[PDB]
Structure formats: C-alpha cells, structure tokens
Design a protein around this ligand. Structure first.
Ligand SMILES: CS(=O)(=O)c1cccc(-n2ccc(=O)c(-c3ccnn3-c3cc(F)ccc3F)n2)c1
Ligand SMILES: [Cl-]
Ligand SMILES: [Mg+2]
Ligand SMILES: [Zn+2]
Length: 313
C-alpha cells in the first residue's frame, strides 16, 4: 500500500493548476491519472492491480482519432481533479471515485463523428440509442470493461454504494451530450438566481455534476493560448472529416464542418465561446467559486480569437 506515484517537480506543482497540459509523453498519462486518484481519493480507494488493468483496457478502447482520443480522456479527468481539489469538502467519497472514472471513460470508442452524422448515416448505434447516441455507447463500453475479469475497481464497495457510483457515472457521461448542456445550464442559472439551489437535493447535485462534466469536457478552451490554438486544429480535423462524410451522403454540412469555409473558423470560435463556453464557466463559478480560474482562462482565449479576427494574429 505504501507505493506512491511521484511526478517530477514541475508536473507535481503544475498538475494542481486548472491550465495543466499533460504533455506529449503518452506513457506518463496512466501514472498521471493514478497520481490524481491517489491525491483526490486516497491510495486505498482502488486495488492498484485492478486500477492499472482498468486504465490500460480503457486506453485500448480509445481510437487513434485526431481529438476524441486517449489524450482527451486524461485531459478531461485532470480538469475534474482540479475542480474536486479546489472543492474538497463539497463532494462525497463515492462522487470523487465515480467522477474521475466517469471523465476517463466519457468518450470510450469514439469514432470522431457527432450523434448527427450517426443518425444521417443510419448507423446501428443510432437505432440502439435514439438520443445521446455516442454517450449511451460510452457508458455501455464503461460497464463492459468494469466486467472483464480482474477489472472491477469497485469490487470492495457494498451493493448499494456500487449501484450509486454506476448511477453517478451514467448521468455524468450522459451529461457530456452538449445538446443536453443548454437546458441543464438554463435551469441551474434559474435556481442560483432564485436561491432555490440546494446541494442536498440529489437532482440539484445531478445538474451541478452535469455542468462540471461540460466544463471538464470543454476544458481545451481554458488552457494557455498555445495549447488552446493547437487543440483547435485537432478539433477541426474531426469536424472537417465529418463534413467530407456528410458531402459523401449528399448533404451540405454546416460551415463549422466544411473545410471549404476554413476562413470562418475564428468567427465560429467566438460564437462557441459566447454561446457555450463562457456561459458554462460563468454558471460553474457562481455555484463553485474556486473554479473561477477556468472562467478567467476562457475569457483570455476569447480575447486571443478576437485578436485573430482583427488580423493582429
Ligand atoms: C453547433 S453547437 O451545438 O454549438 C456545437 C456542437 C458540437 C461542437 C461544437 N463546437 C464548436 C467549436 C468548438 O471549438 C467546440 C469545442 C471546443 C472544445 N471542445 N469542443 C467540442 C465539444 C463537443 F461536444 C464535441 C466536439 C468538440 F470539439 N465545439 C459546437
Ligand atoms: Cl489533498
Ligand atoms: Mg462525447
Ligand atoms: Zn469529450
């Protein structure tokens, strides 16, 4: 039990900060995640043998796509770690366990295509799961991996603790469907502003955990500008591949996905910051004040894109 994961000094210090980038060394990402579980949760909350085997099976079931890959999973898990560590006392033992795993597993077996493309292609997954298509698949994949021999990291939880954590993970992964984000945030905005928000109301927690998941998922817009700008290439590589596939189905894609309209990206980023990312981190900061650094970094990156449009870069 007395085996700690230890990171070089720079990573040890910077991993605590919201804007940490996990770096280009793939083989350090597992250690970085176990490190975050040990500090967030405890060295006893998982059997290392089972955790390690769970992490490497999850890694294996992420695909070699430009953005929705293993690096994305660990990046989203790290943002969640930063939130839990800046909000120590507000979350239960089970919520800390469930949510880091939820974040690691939230895009399992992503193919690089939106729910929309699956529906218009008429993919079997779109028949199995009529809404939040990929997110139901992601949870399904999470459950399948937990059930491989020697992979059940929740074994030593009671039957009711176990049912609770799988329920936390299911809602967390479903909430990463950005189509559900708009309504979730509207409701949390209303409840905060009437003083009706109660963290003892489970269905209020559910919504707050929902908004944290959107925050962690979108967290590439909260990094130092050079990280944010370079992730955007990966994001748009997937978008333009989906646009190509739309044109193959005979559908003109939205401009976001059309690689012909590559000139419109800077304005498209402003819309996304203004319509999605700024509202998301604003409402998160209202509910969880210590997550303000995510709103601040997001605002800095909005300004960086405004400079791109104004020809200053
Ligand atoms: C038209 S809309 O409903 O506003 C809508 C639907 C889907 C994607 C975007 N969108 C546009 C521009 C971006 O930069 C991102 C972005 C930034 C960080 N993560 N993501 C992201 C988020 C996802 F959910 C999926 C894939 C992603 F790259 N997302 C907008
Ligand atoms: Cl601590
Ligand atoms: Mg997803
Ligand atoms: Zn994601």
């Amino acid at each position: 039990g007395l085996m700690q994961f230890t990171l070089p000094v720079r990573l040890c210090k910077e991993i605590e900060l919201f804007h940490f980038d996990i770096g280009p060394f793939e083989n350090m990402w597992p250690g970085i995640f176990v490190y975050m579980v040990h500090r967030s949760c405890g060295t006893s909350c998982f059997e290392l043998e089972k955790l390690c085997r769970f992490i490497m099976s999850v890694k294996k079931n992420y695909r070699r796509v430009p953005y929705h890959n293993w690096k994305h999973a660990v990046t989203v898990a790290h943002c969640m770690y930063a939130i839990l560590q800046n909000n120590h006392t507000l979350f239960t033992d089970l919520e800390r366990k469930g949510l880091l795993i939820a974040c690691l597993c939230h895009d399992l077996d992503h193919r690089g295509f939106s729910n929309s493309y699956l529906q218009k292609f008429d993919h079997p997954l779109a028949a199995l799961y009529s809404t939040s298509t990929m997110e139901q698949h992601h949870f399904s994949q999470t459950v399948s991996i937990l059930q491989l021999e020697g992979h059940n990291i929740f074994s030593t939880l009671s039957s009711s603790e176990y049912e609770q954590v799988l329920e936390i993970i299911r809602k967390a992964i479903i909430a990463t469907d950005l189509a559900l984000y708009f309504g979730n945030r509207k409701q949390l905005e209303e409840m905060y502003q009437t003083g009706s928000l109660n963290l003892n109301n489970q269905s209020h927690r559910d919504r707050v955990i929902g908004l944290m998941m959107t925050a962690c998922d979108l967290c590439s817009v909260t990094k130092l500008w050079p990280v944010t700008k370079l992730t955007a290439n990966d994001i748009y590589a997937e978008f333009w591949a989906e646009g190509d596939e739309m044109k193959k189905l005979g559908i003109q894609p939205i401009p976001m996905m059309d690689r012909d309209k590559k000139d419109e990206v800077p304005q498209g980023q402003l819309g996304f910051y203004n319509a999605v990312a700024i509202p998301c981190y604003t409402t998160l900061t209202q509910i969880l004040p210590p997550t303000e650094p995510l709103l601040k970094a997001c605002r800095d990156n909005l300004s960086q894109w405004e400079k791109v449009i104004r020809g200053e870069e």
